[PDB]
Amino acid sequence: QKLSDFHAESGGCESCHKDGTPSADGAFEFAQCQSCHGKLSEMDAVHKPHDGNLVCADCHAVHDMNVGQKPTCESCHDDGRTSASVL
Ligand code: HEC
Ligand code: HEC
Ligand code: HEC
Ligand code: HEC
First CA to last CA distance, the chain? 26
E strands of 1-87, at which residues? none
User: Mind listing the domains of the chain with CATH numbers?
Assistant: 1-87 (1.10.1130.10)
Q: Which residues line ligand 4 (CB under 6 A)?
A: 46, 49-50, 53-54, 58-59, 71-73, 75-77, 81, 83, 86
Distances (CA, A) of 27 to 2, 45, 51, 57: 21, 23, 15, 10
d(CA 24, CA 61): 16
Task: Identify the nearest ligand to the CA of 70 by its number.
Answer: 3
Among candidates 45, 49, 52, 47, which has minimal Cα distance to 37?
47
Kindly report the backbone phi and psi dihedral angles of residue 68, in degrees, each rounded to the nearest multiple of 5, phi listed first: 95, -15
* Final resolution, Å: 1.5
Instruction: Return contacts of 18-27, CB within 8 angstroms, 24+ apart.
Output: 26/55, 26/57
SS3 of 56-73: HHHCCCCCCCECCCCCCC
How was this model experimentally determined? Answer: X-ray
Is 7 in contact with 62 (CB distance < 8 Å)?
Answer: yes
